[PDB]
Enzyme design. Structure first.
Site, PDB file in Angstrom:
ATOM      1  N   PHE A 150       3.063  38.341 -34.366  1.00  0.00           N
ATOM      2  CA  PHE A 150       3.371  37.537 -34.942  1.00  0.00           C
ATOM      3  C   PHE A 150       3.201  36.273 -34.984  1.00  0.00           C
ATOM      4  CE2 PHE A 150       6.553  33.800 -35.497  1.00  0.00           C
ATOM      5  CZ  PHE A 150       7.119  34.351 -36.196  1.00  0.00           C
TER       6      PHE A 150
ATOM      7  N   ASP B 162      -5.717  33.183 -33.488  1.00  0.00           N
ATOM      8  CA  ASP B 162      -4.236  32.576 -33.733  1.00  0.00           C
ATOM      9  C   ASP B 162      -3.619  32.077 -32.465  1.00  0.00           C
ATOM     10  OD1 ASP B 162      -1.160  31.958 -33.710  1.00  0.00           O
ATOM     11  OD2 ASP B 162      -0.559  33.565 -34.787  1.00  0.00           O
TER      12      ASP B 162
ATOM     13  N   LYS C  69       2.233  24.412 -32.080  1.00  0.00           N
ATOM     14  CA  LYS C  69       3.095  24.178 -31.491  1.00  0.00           C
ATOM     15  C   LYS C  69       2.387  22.731 -30.597  1.00  0.00           C
ATOM     16  CE  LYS C  69       4.775  28.516 -31.241  1.00  0.00           C
ATOM     17  NZ  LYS C  69       6.609  27.891 -30.933  1.00  0.00           N
TER      18      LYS C  69
HETATM   19  C1  LIG Z   1       1.155  32.768 -32.226  1.00  0.00           C
HETATM   20  C2  LIG Z   1       2.472  32.615 -33.219  1.00  0.00           C
HETATM   21  N1  LIG Z   1       1.811  32.405 -35.088  1.00  0.00           N
HETATM   22  C3  LIG Z   1       1.977  31.591 -35.442  1.00  0.00           C
HETATM   23  C4  LIG Z   1       3.532  31.496 -35.177  1.00  0.00           C
HETATM   24  C5  LIG Z   1       4.207  30.405 -36.837  1.00  0.00           C
HETATM   25  O1  LIG Z   1       4.350  28.908 -36.379  1.00  0.00           O
HETATM   26  P1  LIG Z   1       5.439  28.542 -37.357  1.00  0.00           P
HETATM   27  O2  LIG Z   1       6.540  28.525 -36.562  1.00  0.00           O
HETATM   28  O3  LIG Z   1       5.182  26.931 -36.826  1.00  0.00           O
HETATM   29  O4  LIG Z   1       4.758  27.833 -38.969  1.00  0.00           O
HETATM   30  C6  LIG Z   1       4.248  31.028 -34.064  1.00  0.00           C
HETATM   31  C7  LIG Z   1       5.388  30.969 -33.668  1.00  0.00           C
HETATM   32  O5  LIG Z   1       6.137  30.928 -32.859  1.00  0.00           O
HETATM   33  C8  LIG Z   1       3.724  31.750 -33.171  1.00  0.00           C
HETATM   34  O6  LIG Z   1       3.776  32.163 -31.514  1.00  0.00           O
END
Ligand SMILES: Cc1ncc(COP(=O)(O)O)c(C=O)c1O
Ligand SMILES: Cc1ncc(COP(=O)(O)O)c(C=O)c1O
Ligand code: NA
Ligand code: NA
Lengths: 388, 397
Positions: free
Chosen positions: B136, B221, B250
């Site tokens: 994700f 990520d 986050k």
């Molecule tokens: C690993 C990861 N990357 C990217 C995102 C995207 O973050 P945002 O929801 O702040 O756009 C999330 C959101 O859950 C995530 O868990």
């Protein structure tokens, strides 16, 4: 090409339409951080909303709803064509949501093959791979590998070209009612109404990107209200939060229902802190008095720009709507917009460009008359240095 | 008219199915709804409120910067952005930082940068991105296409091409698909959403070696596993594997929308100051957050607290026979349900909420916990007793 401040111009403090840098130099702000601080810097109502919500609750995720989001959604629904809203963080994110929604609606309601998006040369919709590919400046979308396909660009304000490319395989027309970055060019009435009629004919959704021209900027709450042309989906950001990162995508229940649980999402989007601040901003901007003042103030700026042109002979056109102002340079000054901007900064006034040939102004919607006069005097002085 | 749960369905796009209750106030790891019901928060708004709700230091930073300057455009830098950039650069492999609002935006920036670096430094044809099943990376068209869940990327028209998915932790599959036309490998060091699955050491080291071999960039990520979540400042530090680009969000802002893309000067130069962008307000708050999370005491505490949670989950399993595995790192915790409870994670989440504890899922088979990194021991015990009661209620039925 890009405009960047040098190491000796770092803003440290803002109040109203005045900004101070590390050296304590004071500037009059006619740029608003690119049409973002629509109520100026550290507006007391916005500071109060930030602080009070900041003591209470900032974030819960979309596992939940929250009161400031629901209050803000209700306000946007009551004031506009919208029946449903989604909150995100940036204009780019709101546009991503809008474009995905138009695509998904076509896919589920009509055909998975109904994918063409029509957009316009010189459009700006953000910097994500999809939004920059919908944007109409190939220089900005080149060089990132395979672009998302089925996006067709034609000239802004060319209705014939739109009619020529649109078909039953078209899912959306995406347009800024005024192209802010693209030289401050307003849609003609015929063109914008034409887009609505063509979308109706082809069962495509009309998407208005009002990230820059929305939330009071034109002197109506949204530019669509000036034109009397209602889109299917509208995006808003920038002024919406007066400097706090927040955005919204507005649509109808019929269209929103194409999304199911999990079709889109956001960690921060619909944040109670953001929505408390945007609620405070909304309450001020959406008043007869503030919207009227935007028109008064526009003419104050325009009269100064006309006076500057009378003295220095530098403009071919003054355009835009409300407090989005464009001043196009004469051929003798083609490509000089950046130089007038830097000269402005030396003279203590912050302005914008809209490409290399156009000066752009996007001050606070409540900029004081005394700041308009003082800042435009500074700009006139900068003009004198560039040309005389 | 009063605001109720029914108000959601009348106002927001139907992309969420939110809880029956509406949180109105939070302090530390406790949250109250409109009825004044008190909950223990083990969800953190999905691993976001890493210092809990309305942490006094973060509130102070918000108020202080809030009366000073909120916003600059990217034409300018600002003191909070510079300070936060310096902190990140000093603490990590990074030499340059670009700030954005969300994890999705940070990942957009990272993926566009890896693509553009390949284009200008190697060949316009070097475009393949390798990513992983169940990944994700966000919801923009590009990031959701790099994400490894076809359910979320289907149905939006033509996807950005040249993205290849293989199984997480399958190093041979990565080796098989990589070549001189590969620009990047994108990986979550721990897949949070994807069932709380940690990279193995050989897998993650393997990615670094293959990226070196093929002149591709390794992109971590760390939106979910970064900023202290694992008990190191970033997960890469636990592993001892240095990526080329890293994304963070986050926890970075403790609840304020902010994100960061970290890389080297050599890579950052492909984009045409050690920092770019950053909202002054956002960066002030993130700076205050960083100052607390990046301390020996807080990072040590994350491990202490993890074991307090794990001991509770073990006791719950001893009594109720519900978990096959307890996993994750630091205060990202996954508890996989035994086959008898396969697909029932949402049932335990709902029972948890009824019992006054907020938890998460990580797919339908896994309970996920992502509390404040400074959650008080009293809150861990109280919340885990509530969760034990919820499990008891479900299993009794
Ligand atoms: C690993 C990861 N990357 C990217 C995102 C995207 O973050 P945002 O929801 O702040 O756009 C999330 C959101 O859950 C995530 O868990
Ligand atoms: C019309 C338009 N749309 C979208 C965007 C992108 O918004 P953001 O910068 O909030 O991501 C901008 C930014 O300038 C804009 O002018
Ligand atoms: Na309405
Ligand atoms: Na460093």
């Amino acid at each position: 090409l890009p405009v960047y401040a040098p190491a000796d111009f770092i803003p440290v403090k803002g109040k109203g339409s005045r900004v101070w840098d590390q050296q304590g130099k004071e500037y009059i702000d006619f740029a608003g951080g690119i049409a973002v601080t629509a109520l100026g810097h550290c507006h007391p109502a916005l500071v109060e909303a930030l602080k009070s919500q900041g003591e209470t609750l900032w974030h819960t995720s979309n596992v939940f709803t929250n009161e400031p989001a629901l209050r803000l959604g209700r306000k946007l629904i009551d004031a506009t064509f919208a029946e449903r809203v989604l909150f995100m963080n940036s204009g780019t994110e709101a546009n991503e949501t809008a474009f995905k929604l138009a695509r998904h609606y076509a896919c589920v309601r009509h055909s998975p093959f109904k994918t063409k998006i029509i957009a316009f040369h010189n459009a700006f919709h953000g910097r994500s791979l999809f939004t920059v590919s919908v944007g109409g400046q190939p220089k900005y979308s080149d060089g990132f590998g395979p672009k998302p396909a089925d996006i067709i660009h034609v000239p802004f304000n060319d209705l014939h070209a739109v009619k020529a490319v649109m078909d039953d395989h078209t899912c959306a027309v995406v347009v800024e009612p005024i192209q802010g970055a693209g030289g401050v060019q307003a849609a003609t009435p015929e063109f914008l109404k034409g887009l609505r009629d063509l979308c109706d004919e082809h069962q495509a959704l009309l998407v208005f990107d009002e990230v820059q021209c929305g939330m009071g900027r034109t002197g109506d709450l949204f530019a669509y209200m000036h034109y009397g042309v209602t889109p299917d989906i509208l995006t808003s950001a920038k002024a919406l939060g007066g400097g706090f990162p927040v955005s919204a995508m507005l649509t109808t229940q019929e269209i929103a229902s194409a999304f199911h649980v999990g079709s889109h999402g956001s960690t921060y989007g619909g944040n109670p802190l953001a929505c408390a601040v945007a609620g405070a901003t909304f309450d001020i901007i959406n008043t007869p008095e503030v919207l009227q003042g935007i028109h008064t103030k526009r003419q104050q700026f325009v009269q100064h720009l006309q006076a500057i042109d009378e003295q220095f002979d530098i403009f071919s056109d003054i355009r835009g709507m409300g407090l989005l102002i464009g001043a196009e340079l004469k051929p003798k000054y083609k490509g000089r917009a950046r130089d007038f901007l830097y000269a402005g900064a030396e003279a203590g006034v912050m302005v914008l460009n809209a490409g290399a040939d156009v000066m752009r102004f996007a001050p606070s919607l409540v900029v004081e008359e005394a700041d308009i006069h003082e800042g435009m005097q500074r700009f006139a002085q900068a003009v004198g240095k560039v040309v005389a």
